[PDB]
Subunit: 108 residues, 3 copies
C-alpha cells in the first residue's frame, strides 16, 4: 500500500525527468548548430580581413611610389625654372646689345 | 513480486538516465570550449579590423595631401607656361629688331 | 524491508539526478547567452569589414586617378622642356646674328 504510493510518486518523477532530458537534448542540438554556423562565419571574416590587410599593404606601397614621383616632378620643375631665369637674363642682355647697336647706327 | 518487477523496471530507467546525463555533460563541455575559442577569435578579428580602419584613415589623409600636391604642381606648370609665352614674344620682337637693323646697314 | 532499502536507494538517486538536471539547465542557459552575444559581434564585424572593403575600392580608384594625373604632369614637363630647347636655339642664333652685325659696324 504505502509502498505503492511511493512507487507512484517515483514513476511520475521519472516521467518528468525523461521529458526534461529530451528537451535538454533538443536545446543542446540547437546550440551546436548555432555554434558551427558562428565558427564558419568567423573563418569567413578572417579570410576577408587578411584579404583587406594585403590590399592596405599594396596601397601603402603605391602611396610611397606616388609620393616619390611627385617629389621628382616638383624637382624637375625647379630645374626648369632655374633654366628660365638664365634665359631671361640672356634676353635682357640681348635687348641691351640691340639698343647699343641702334645707338651706333643713329650716330653714324 | 509484481512490485519487484516494477522496481526492476525503475532501476533500469535510472541506469539509462544516468548515462544520458553523463553524455549530455560531455556534449556541453565540448560546446563550452568551442564557444570560448570562438569568443577569442572574434576579439582577434575586431582588433585586426580596428587596426585596418586606422590604416584606411591614414591612407585617406595621404591621398588628400597627394592630391593637393599634384594640383599645386599642375598650377606651377601653368605659371611656367605663361612665362614661356612671354619669352617667345620677346624673342620674336628681337628677331624683328635684328632684321630691321640689318636693313639699315644694307641701305648704308 | 529489503524493498524499503531499495526504494531509499532509488529516492536518493532521483534527488541527485534532479539536481544534475537543474545545474545542466543553468549551464545551457549560460552558453545560450554567450552564443547570442557572439552571433551579434560577428555581425558587427562583418558590417565593419564590408565597410572597409568599400573604402579600399574607393582608395584604389583614387590611386589610379592620381597616377594618371602624375603621368600627365610628367608629360607636360617634357613638352615644356622640348620648348625650352627651341628657345635656347633661337637665343644662340640671335647671339650670333648680333655678333655678325657688330662686325659690320666695326668694319665701317
Ligand atoms: Cl559561438
Ligand atoms: Cl568575427
Ligand atoms: Cl605631379
Ligand atoms: Cl577589415
Amino acid at each position: 500500500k504505502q509502498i505503492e504510493d511511493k512507487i507512484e510518486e517515483i514513476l511520475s518523477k521519472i516521467y518528468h525527468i525523461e521529458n526534461e532530458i529530451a528537451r535538454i537534448k533538443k536545446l543542446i542540438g540547437a546550440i551546436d548548430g548555432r555554434v558551427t554556423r558562428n565558427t564558419q562565419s568567423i573563418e569567413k571574416n578572417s579570410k576577408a580581413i587578411a584579404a583587406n590587410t594585403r590590399t592596405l599593404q599594396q596601397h601603402s606601397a603605391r602611396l610611397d611610389s606616388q609620393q616619390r614621383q611627385i617629389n621628382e616632378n616638383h624637382k624637375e620643375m625647379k630645374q626648369i625654372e632655374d633654366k628660365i631665369e638664365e634665359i631671361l637674363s640672356k634676353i635682357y642682355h640681348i635687348e641691351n646689345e640691340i639698343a647699343r647697336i641702334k645707338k651706333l647706327i643713329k650716330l653714324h
